[PDB]
């Protein structure tokens, strides 16, 4: 790999510099090189990996959405479709890269925190592939996303308190899957509601080092429920 000659610690340091510089493709490349050293990631490093790729793919998703909307408004020349397909292919290549790292290196064994986080990540990037998929593929990707989310859900309910931010973020994203991808708004609404209600019922489990993250997700669950009702 392009990062093969660089020390793991230097790769982590440069990922942090790239985040500060808002160079998220660089940051993702550095974090990929760090993963490929084959050691586990700490919580801080998992956050760098997460932030990097989510920034890269988020810009691709937002571009895809602009072009796809132009494409559909023009169905009421080949250039819009071609350019949309070009962005789509790039997005799928980024999702394939992330899913490959998860399967090749990251998902194992290990923290319950870390196992849940990687399975949630797997669900997310299958979901991003599902946003642009069609046909025989699309059903494959959707079941892949569900299976990853559902395994993460089982572990999280077993091993983490109901305010844990990975637990909450996973439940938030799983409900978005139900609503936006699986077309199961009742499933999405019931998951969002019980997730929020169970966090409030066990509010006392907020952690000193992550309570701002937890309460942010609880509010996002409530915003989705208002949107959906």
């Amino acid at each position: 790999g392009a990062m093969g000659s660089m020390e793991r610690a230097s790769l982590i340091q440069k990922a942090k510099l790239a985040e500060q510089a808002e160079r998220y493709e660089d940051m993702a490349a550095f974090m990929k090189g760090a993963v490929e050293k084959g050691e586990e990631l700490s919580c801080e490093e998992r956050n760098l990996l997460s932030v990097a790729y989510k920034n890269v793919v988020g810009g691709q998703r937002a571009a895809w959405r602009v072009l796809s909307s132009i494409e559909q408004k023009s169905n009421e020349g080949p250039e819009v479709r071609e350019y949309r397909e070009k962005v789509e292919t790039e997005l799928q290549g980024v999702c394939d890269t992330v899913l490959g790292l998860l399967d090749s290196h990251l998902i194992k064994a290990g923290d319950a925190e870390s196992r849940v986080f990687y399975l949630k990540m797997k669900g997310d990037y299958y979901r991003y592939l599902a946003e642009v998929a069609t046909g025989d593929d699309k059903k494959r990707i959707i079941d892949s996303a569900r299976s990853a989310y559902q395994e993460a859900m089982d572990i999280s309910k077993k091993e983490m308190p109901p305010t844990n931010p990975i637990r909450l973020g996973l439940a938030l994203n799983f409900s978005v899957f139900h609503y936006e991808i699986a077309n199961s708004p009742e499933e999405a609404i019931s998951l969002a509601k019980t997730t929020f209600d169970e966090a409030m019922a066990d509010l006392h489990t907020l952690s000193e080092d992550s309570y701002k993250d937890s309460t942010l997700i609880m509010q996002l669950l409530r915003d989705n429920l208002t949107l959906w009702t």
Binding site: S50, L172, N173, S175, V176, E180, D213, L216, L220, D223
Partner: peptide, 10 residues
């Protein structure tokens, strides 16, 4: 308006 998923922090 689409649903909100987990954001980037820290």
């Amino acid at each position: 308006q689409r649903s909100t998923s987990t954001p980037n922090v820290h």
